[PDB]
């Protein structure tokens with residue numbers, strides 16, 4: 149409970165985008181919405197803590213924030229305190245959006261497909277609620293190789309050594325499957341890199357992100373197995389990664405794929 153809420157805030161701090169980057173992304177998303185004269189309303193499926201939503205909410209756009217997770221929405225509610233007059237919070241499943249047909253102008257989806265086996269049901273709901281001329285706005289972060297990549301690969305290796313090998317490349321495969329559906333559905337997906345930057349991260353911060361299972365790929369392992377892997381990984385890092393508090397750069401990019409009805 150308090151534990152679930154802390155994990156939610158932890159997720160928010162780990163995935164936060166630098167202010168300039170948040171701004172670049174929000175501008176690209178707002179530019180893609182074409183409301184013929186109406187006040188544009190955005191719907192985000194899997195809004196989480198509101199990492200993607202706040203930048204837009206802050207600029208005054210009507211926003212419907214949908215998520216199945218109560219703890220994530222509790223953080224979202226606190227994050228938008230004082231700037232929530234045009235926000236509607238919704239606790240529901242993206243496979244059954246409680247909104248009318250043709251009721252929104254843009255539907256935002258960032259880091260959700262890989263968590264939904266029957267994602268085509270979500271895509272169909274997004275299309276159902278989008279108004280003619282509406283846009284599906286998919287976004288995702290990408291990272292280049294760094295010591296964080298080395299740590300994550302070491303985690304994967306240790307997991308396999310414990311007898312629990314983990315799946316690789318689900319987000320990317322899922323993303324391709326969705327593009328296949330978007331083409332087929334006549335939504336003409338257009339992808340563009342909307343932000344590229346380098347941020348600092350220390351070996352210790354990367355280890356803590358793994359410890360707290362803040363990455364979906366670390367969530368499959370039984371918790372005690374992850375606990376054993378983390379003890380191994382902290383010791384390995386202390387022996388092989390030098391000053392655990394020395395920052396290293398991590399180059400990232402954010403891609404936006406816009407499809408239109």
Ligand SMILES: C[S@@+](CC[C@H](N)C(=O)[O-])C[C@H]1O[C@@H](n2cnc3c(N)ncnc32)[C@H](O)[C@@H]1O
Pocket residue numbers: 163193194195196197198199200214215216217220240241242243257258259260263264
């Ligand atoms: C990986 S997070 C990303 C949140 C936010 N979009 C961001 O980019 O920071 C995934 C979110 O989707 C939610 N979620 C997963 N499956 C869902 C579903 N079926 N319906 C609604 N929300 C779902 C999770 O609870 C979580 O908040």
